[PDB]
Amino acid sequence: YAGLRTPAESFGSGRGQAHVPKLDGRARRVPQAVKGRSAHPPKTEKDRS
Amino acid sequence: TELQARGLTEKTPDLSDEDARLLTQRHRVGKPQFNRQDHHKKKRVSTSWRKPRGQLSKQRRGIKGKGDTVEAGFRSPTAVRGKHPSGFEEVRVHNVDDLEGVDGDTEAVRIASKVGARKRERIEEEAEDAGIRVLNPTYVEV
Amino acid sequence: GISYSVEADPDTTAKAMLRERQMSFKHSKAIAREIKGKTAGEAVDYLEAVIEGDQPVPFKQHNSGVGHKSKVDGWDAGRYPEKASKAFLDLLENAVGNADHQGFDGEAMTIKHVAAHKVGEQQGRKPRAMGRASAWNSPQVDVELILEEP
Amino acid sequence: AEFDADVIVDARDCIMGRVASQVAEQALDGETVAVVNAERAVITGREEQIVEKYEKRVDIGNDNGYFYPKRPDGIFKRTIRGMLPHKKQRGREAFESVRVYLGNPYDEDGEVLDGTSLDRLSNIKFVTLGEISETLGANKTW
RNA sequence: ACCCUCAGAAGGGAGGCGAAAUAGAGCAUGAAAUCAGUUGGCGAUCGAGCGACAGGGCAUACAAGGUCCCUCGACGAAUGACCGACGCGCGAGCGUCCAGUAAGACUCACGGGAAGCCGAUGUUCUGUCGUACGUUUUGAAAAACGAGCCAGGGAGUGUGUCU
RNA sequence: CGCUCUAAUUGGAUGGAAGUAGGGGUGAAAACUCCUAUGGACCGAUUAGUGACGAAAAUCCUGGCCAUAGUAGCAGCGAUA
RNA sequence: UGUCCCAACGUUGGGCCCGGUGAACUGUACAUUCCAGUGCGGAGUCUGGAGACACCCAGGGGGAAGCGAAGACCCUAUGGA
Numbered sequence: 001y002a003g004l005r006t007p008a009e010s011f012g013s014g015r016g017q018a019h020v021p022k023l024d025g026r027a028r029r030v031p032q033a034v035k036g037r038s039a040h041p042p043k044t045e046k047d048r049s
Numbered sequence: 050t051e052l053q054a055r056g057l058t059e060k061t062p063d064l065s066d067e068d069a070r071l072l073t074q075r076h077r078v079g080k081p082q083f084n085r086q087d088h089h090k091k092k093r094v095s096t097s098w099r100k101p102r103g104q105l106s107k108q109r110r111g112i113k114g115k116g117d118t119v120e121a122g123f124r125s126p127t128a129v130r131g132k133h134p135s136g137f138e139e140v141r142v143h144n145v146d147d148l149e150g151v152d153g154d155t156e157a158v159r160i161a162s163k164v165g166a167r168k169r170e171r172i173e174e175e176a177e178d179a180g181i182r183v184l185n186p187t188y189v190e191v
Numbered sequence: 192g193i194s195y196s197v198e199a200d201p202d203t204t205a206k207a208m209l210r211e212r213q214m215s216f217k218h219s220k221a222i223a224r225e226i227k228g229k230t231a232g233e234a235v236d237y238l239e240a241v242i243e244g245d246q247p248v249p250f251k252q253h254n255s256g257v258g259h260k261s262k263v264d265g266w267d268a269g270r271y272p273e274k275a276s277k278a279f280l281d282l283l284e285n286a287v288g289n290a291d292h293q294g295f296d297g298e299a300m301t302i303k304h305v306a307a308h309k310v311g312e313q314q315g316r317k318p319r320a321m322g323r324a325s326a327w328n329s330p331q332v333d334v335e336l337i338l339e340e341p
Numbered sequence: 342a343e344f345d346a347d348v349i350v351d352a353r354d355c356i357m358g359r360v361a362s363q364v365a366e367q368a369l370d371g372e373t374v375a376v377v378n379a380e381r382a383v384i385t386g387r388e389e390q391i392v393e394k395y396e397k398r399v400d401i402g403n404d405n406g407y408f409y410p411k412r413p414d415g416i417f418k419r420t421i422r423g424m425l426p427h428k429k430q431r432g433r434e435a436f437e438s439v440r441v442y443l444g445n446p447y448d449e450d451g452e453v454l455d456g457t458s459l460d461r462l463s464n465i466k467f468v469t470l471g472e473i474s475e476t477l478g479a480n481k482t483w
Numbered sequence: 484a485c486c487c488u489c490a491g492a493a494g495g496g497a498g499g500c501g502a503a504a505u506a507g508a509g510c511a512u513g514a515a516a517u518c519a520g521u522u523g524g525c526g527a528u529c530g531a532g533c534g535a536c537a538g539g540g541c542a543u544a545c546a547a548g549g550u551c552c553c554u555c556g557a558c559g560a561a562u563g564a565c566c567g568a569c570g571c572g573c574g575a576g577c578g579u580c581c582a583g584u585a586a587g588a589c590u591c592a593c594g595g596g597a598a599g600c601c602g603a604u605g606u607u608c609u610g611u612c613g614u615a616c617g618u619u620u621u622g623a624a625a626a627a628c629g630a631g632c633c634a635g636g637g638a639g640u641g642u643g644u645c646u
Numbered sequence: 647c648g649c650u651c652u653a654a655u656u657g658g659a660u661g662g663a664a665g666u667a668g669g670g671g672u673g674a675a676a677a678c679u680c681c682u683a684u685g686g687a688c689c690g691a692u693u694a695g696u697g698a699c700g701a702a703a704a705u706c707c708u709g710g711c712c713a714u715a716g717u718a719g720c721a722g723c724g725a726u727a
Numbered sequence: 728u729g730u731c732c733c734a735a736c737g738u739u740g741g742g743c744c745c746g747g748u749g750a751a752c753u754g755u756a757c758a759u760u761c762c763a764g765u766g767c768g769g770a771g772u773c774u775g776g777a778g779a780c781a782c783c784c785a786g787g788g789g790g791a792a793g794c795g796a797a798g799a800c801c802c803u804a805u806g807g808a
């Protein structure tokens with residue numbers, strides 16, 4: 001759930017801004033966002049044997 | 050009273066006629082810079098080479114003036130490829146034991162930068178006595 | 192802050208610095224530029240005349256919208272930045288003071304080196320229309336001066 | 342005011358464009374040329390159409406400007422400039438070592454360049470730079 | 484610490500400590516964007532994808548590259564003469580011989596020379612070519628879309644099953 | 647080709663490691679390497695692995711910064727001080 | 728009855744110059760342009776010419792198919808309400 005604990009939403013078109021989820025004026029959640037989730041991180045379910 | 054370099058600094062390797070010819074060729078023909086397209090137009094774009102991929106790329110399309118595109122055709126002659134400009138083939142050396150097996154007539158030695166002064170001193174006096182030139186010698190005031 | 196950006200022989204030189212001054216950096220570049228090469232006493236007389244309004248300071252770079260001044264030589268735009276000028280009088284007062292404490296004839300020494308550097312900005316905000324606020328900052332200026340025997 | 346010309350060309354009864362073409366060729370070869378008696382240079386054709394063309398060049402223009410010369414002096418020089426890359430360094434140098442004169446300010450007589458002479462006994466349809474200038478409104482100072 | 488300066492517990496100067504204060508307080512290192520000063524090159528008559536490749540100017544402490552230039556000679560691929568002689572053409576010119584000769588890129592040797600001198604690096608000038616990049620598109624320099632600049636961040640990963 | 651960490655084999659470093667800046671050499675190239683200054687403690691190579699492994703771009707994200715500019719505003723309201 | 732013919736003079740606050748304070752919008756790059764042409768047919772940057780010594784102040788806004796807003800029209804989606 002790392003990076004997913006936020007209700008951040010995108011404003012969509014209109015304010016001359018990229019459609020990036022934001023909260024309190026801060027971008028969040030998405031992988032390209034600082035403090036955003038990891039796109040394809042190490043996973044516990046992986047069989048390493 | 051002046052600075053002098055340790056070892057066989059002026060030593061030249063002995064090459065076959067053909068190798069001296071090809072070494073002379075490599076040096077005469079040279080090659081283009083081969084820097085990435087438009088590296089000079091944007092500071093965030095470095096010089097390090099990248100194949101131009103743009104569908105409309107002028108360099109990719111081979112338009113004269115947009116710089117040469119890396120191709121096997123630019124390869125240097127096998128017989129001389131990689132040689133120091135002096136003609137010597139270089140041997141990376143980290144200690145005295147690395148000097149063993151090195152032919153001072155065909156190879157010159159290059160002491161890793163990480164090696165310290167103490168160990169360099171031994172490596173340098175041991176290479177000179179072995180007839181091996183040291184490409185990056187220590188300069189001492191004698 | 193800055194460090195002197197030029198070497199100085201202590202036996203024939205006196206130094207001085209201003210730190211984090213809250214004054215126009217743009218005015219400082221202009222003033223430094225204008226007094227470099229002058230004698231301390233000349234620089235002082237010059238700056239007092241600027242503050243008095245009798246001598247304009249050429250604005251050769253930060254000149255947008257600046258009105259021309261007849262007394263400006265070899266250039267057109269100039270002004271009378273009295274604030275930054277007073278800061279320079281302090282700097283000169285310090286330099287010449289140090290100069291004399293060392294045995295030199297302060298006032299007579301040449302301003303060998305003088306340059307202003309923007310060391311930072313004191314930040315401020317200003318409310319604006321439509322529920323937004325924008326920057327309203329103060330420049331922070333350091334300036335170095337090296338005096339040298341004639 | 343004194344012009345050490347290596348060559349002095351006499352344009353009298355000579356086809357302007359042909360002289361121009363040769364004076365340009367020589368100027369580019371480093372020759373300093375002085376074209377003399379420009380008012381007497383000649384251009385073949387029907388006077389009415391010829392004048393209509395030069396009148397159009399005079400009427401053309403706007404704020405940027407299309408300053409076209411009216412004196413045979415300038416007409417001829419402009420004619421030469423059009424045969425020189427006057428905006429390039431070598432071109433401006435060539436052009437600048439060429440001067441045109443009304444009458445002949447020298448003591449020597451100009452020489453007639455081969456292939457540029459017009460035989461008045463064999464031609465009735467041609468005009469004179471001076472005539473063109475007068476029509477254009479120039480002040481016949483020659 | 485002490486001293487000097489200053490309206491001054493500020494700041495500055497000098498000084499003391501420490502291997503180091505360019506370790507003096509968001510005080511290990513200290514990139515880029517970028518700013519001040521300054522060095523080299525260009526610069527107030529001249530033209531715009533900012534360059535690539537050639538070749539000139541000016542600039543260059545050492546180290547990590549050591550080559551380069553001219554006479555002559557040797558070798559000498561494709562190509563390839565002048566002149567002279569003879570013969571044709573109205574003419575521009577051509578044929579035969581001289582002759583596949585002289586010449587001919589590279590490379591080498593002798594003799595002489597260069598050390599800002601050769602390479603290289605910075606900038607600038609000349610020549611040739613040249614209307615970014617990525618994307619959308621039949622067609623992009625595009626009056627189609629994206630980016631102010633830089634740094635850092637930023638996209639084929641796991642389980643199960645099948646082949 | 648380059649990056650991380652693991653292992654085996656094997657080396658470097660306070661007689662100065664990594665990093666950074668400027669510069670020399672090699673490689674078609676990814677990139678490798680040396681010199682000098684800074685730095686002041688760590689750093690490799692080979693082989694077999696491992697993978698939150700490579701950016702110029704997404705009105706991409708965050709931080710920093712320049713031109714804009716010494717510019718607009720610091721006048722306008724029946725309360726002109 | 729200055730809405731108009733047809734505009735004038737004046738008043739107050741700005742505007743302009745000076746001290747102090749001091750933002751923002753916008754920025755791929757280059758950029759002194761003009762006339763024609765060419766080009767995805769609506770070019771400061773391509774071609775040909777013309778013109779063009781550098782910098783600065785004030786101005787009204789012709790152009791940058793100016794800036795601001797992933798067209799509210801129209802169509803398309805086995806979209807939403």
Ligand SMILES: [Cl-]
Pocket residue numbers: 121124
């Ligand atoms: Cl290969």
Ligand SMILES: [Cl-]
Pocket residue numbers: 216217309330
């Ligand atoms: Cl500022």
Ligand SMILES: [Cl-]
Pocket residue numbers: 401402403404405406407408
């Ligand atoms: Cl005109």
Ligand SMILES: [Cl-]
Pocket residue numbers: 425426427428429432
């Ligand atoms: Cl031209």
Ligand SMILES: [Cl-]
Pocket residue numbers: 463464465466467
């Ligand atoms: Cl006739």
Ligand SMILES: [Cl-]
Pocket residue numbers: 070074589590
């Ligand atoms: Cl050869």
Ligand SMILES: [Cl-]
Pocket residue numbers: 639
């Ligand atoms: Cl893939």
Ligand SMILES: [Mg+2]
Pocket residue numbers: 002003035036037038
């Ligand atoms: Mg996170």
Ligand SMILES: [Mg+2]
Pocket residue numbers: 087088089090091092093094095096
């Ligand atoms: Mg770049």
Ligand SMILES: [Mg+2]
Pocket residue numbers: 255256257258
């Ligand atoms: Mg103004």
Ligand SMILES: [Mg+2]
Pocket residue numbers: 321322
């Ligand atoms: Mg409100």
Ligand SMILES: [Mg+2]
Pocket residue numbers: none
């Ligand atoms: Mg620090």
Ligand SMILES: [Mg+2]
Pocket residue numbers: 655656692693
């Ligand atoms: Mg091994």
Ligand SMILES: [Mg+2]
Pocket residue numbers: none
């Ligand atoms: Mg990265």
Ligand SMILES: [Mg+2]
Pocket residue numbers: 617703
């Ligand atoms: Mg890409």
Ligand SMILES: [Mg+2]
Pocket residue numbers: 717
């Ligand atoms: Mg403005």
